[PDB]
Amino acid sequence: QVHLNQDEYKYLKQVEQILREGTRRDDRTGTGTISIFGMQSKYCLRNGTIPLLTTKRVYWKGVLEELLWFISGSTDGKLLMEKNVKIWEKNGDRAFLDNLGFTSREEGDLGPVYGFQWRHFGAKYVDCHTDYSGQGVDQLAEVIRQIKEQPDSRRIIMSAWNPSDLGQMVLPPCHTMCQFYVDNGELSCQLYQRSGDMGLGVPFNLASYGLLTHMIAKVCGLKPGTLVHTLGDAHVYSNHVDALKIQLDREPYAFPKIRFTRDVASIDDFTSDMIALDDYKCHPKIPMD
Amino acid sequence: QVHLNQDEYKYLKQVEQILREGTRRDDRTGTGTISIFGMQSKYCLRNGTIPLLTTKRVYWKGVLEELLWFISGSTDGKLLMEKNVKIWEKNGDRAFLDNLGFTSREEGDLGPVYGFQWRHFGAKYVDCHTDYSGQGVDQLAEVIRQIKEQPDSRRIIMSAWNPSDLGQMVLPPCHTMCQFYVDNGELSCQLYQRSGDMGLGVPFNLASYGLLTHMIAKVCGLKPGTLVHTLGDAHVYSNHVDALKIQLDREPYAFPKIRFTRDVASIDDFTSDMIALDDYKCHPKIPMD
Ligand SMILES: O=c1nc(NO)ccn1[C@H]1C[C@H](O)[C@@H](COP(=O)(O)O)O1
Numbered sequence A, B: 001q002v003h004l005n006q007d008e009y010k011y012l013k014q015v016e017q018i019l020r021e022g023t024r025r026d027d028r029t030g031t032g033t034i035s036i037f038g039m040q041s042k043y044c045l046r047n048g049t050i051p052l053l054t055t056k057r058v059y060w061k062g063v064l065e066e067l068l069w070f071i072s073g074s075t076d077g078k079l080l081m082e083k084n085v086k087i088w089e090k091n092g093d094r095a096f097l098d099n100l101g102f103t104s105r106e107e108g109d110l111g112p113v114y115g116f117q118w119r120h121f122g123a124k125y126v127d128c129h130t131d132y133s134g135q136g137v138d139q140l141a142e143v144i145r146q147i148k149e150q151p152d153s154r155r156i157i158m159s160a161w162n163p164s165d166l167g168q169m170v171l172p173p174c175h176t177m178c179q180f181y182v183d184n185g186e187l188s189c190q191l192y193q194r195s196g197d198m199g200l201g202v203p204f205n206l207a208s209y210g211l212l213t214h215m216i217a218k219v220c221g222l223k224p225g226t227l228v229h230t231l232g233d234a235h236v237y238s239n240h241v242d243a244l245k246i247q248l249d250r251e252p253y254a255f256p257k258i259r260f261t262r263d264v265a266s267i268d269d270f271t272s273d274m275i276a277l278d279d280y281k282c283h284p285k286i287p288m289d
């Protein structure tokens, strides 16, 4: 109970329990998992706090760069790489594309992935250079409309799971849908993750959606509230138990705060240089993985 | 702390926690809610079990008839009515259609609600007497194809949230999507519900998705596992508090068991007369509501 960072103490319990009571799907490719199906955690977003884990470092520049690019509607991993964020690099190089049958496609065309769904759900996908405006349903714009105009609503959902388009995507969505909620003048987010690695993706995903809620709040003139993180397949790679065991023994620091250093016109008006992360205090970089 | 029915003893606390920890959203006019954003619940489905609540009775004829109807792909609430299930009657009769602008629509054309999404996602909706076979993505067929050919998949997802078709729908989807997961040759389901009444709809919903998992499992040759119930807006109506306080008093009975009385060719081959609910033992009806 008596922890500075109580929200992170909790995530450490979650890993502990997956280790303690999860089921193994083993192998010898070295890719085996330990799994709990169905998990839920909450983090407080109040006072500018963003849940970037302090016990293991999170790649803030990729979290930061990739989210701006999601919102921007883009599906060219080329723009992302120009900023030296390479997390989408293996999924867009020519060998991945051709192996998937996507042989009429230029490098970096990831297909109708997240940005495309978020801002043009149901538009007809052509390529990453096509202008898709007025096409498909812009879910992010509508999300902003609802928080402002209909705060009590229980249908503030934005989704990237489009069954119609999933075969054209380089990967299926892993963060599948989210729900915003306003109560008492504070904005909240619940996120559904179909599947997540608890030493890599779940932590990066956590930080991505916290940033989104801080960004979306500033736009609708609300104070941020709580992020609910619901996991579908919350798993651990069993060849980092040693690392996760160390990390489970590190007392967390406080979470960093987000500062927006100028005014924004819309949710399309953030940039790298106006989002400040203050006091991201982190433990030493971990040995095994 | 030995409760015959632990999974439902939990339901009582769930409500109890909304009662004592929840957020008010009052109204003058008798429809006020006390609400918690972000909740999760698990239920055992092993050895025939199905989470139909014993402390307040659930309408099984409605659960049964309506789930069979979703699967069929149907959007005609007149079919649902022919069987004397009246849950969709309000939203399909003509004062509703017209007040939504759906004035070229016959009674009971509910639009592209759950069944149209579940079996023809992305198809072009015309009416409820239209043959859409081969049109759109059959998500239930795909869910079955994966459970069987690809049990390990972390992508077994059927979802009724289609932003393109939402405006043509008499009601937004409350149960927005679900994930399926196999471990141990036992099949579980995690349900996402954007919003829910904890004394009317969450318990009807619980039973529907539990019955679906028993049905889908029998078809794939798997044992039923566990049902994970996640809600976004989990709420209790303010007027029903007197009633829920008693219901919380009541001690649960063991959950009933489902039995299938003949073999099935597909998920399209269940009927009412072959799904048997054994020993649904319940408390008396509530003196308040
Ligand atoms: O944790 C993740 N977060 C992601 N963000 O999108 C993407 C992936 N992952 C992890 C989850 C699984 O380990 C893997 C996805 O593989 P899949 O669920 O089998 O498609 O990547």
Ligand SMILES: O=c1nc(NO)ccn1[C@H]1C[C@H](O)[C@@H](COP(=O)(O)O)O1
Binding pocket: A153, A154, A155, B172, B174, B175, B195, B196, B197, B198, B200, B201, B202, B205
């Ligand atoms: O609990 C529910 N379960 C449903 N499943 O079919 C459908 C509706 N409901 C309840 C939840 C809300 O109280 C209400 C609809 O939520 P709303 O669309 O935000 O009004 O009905």
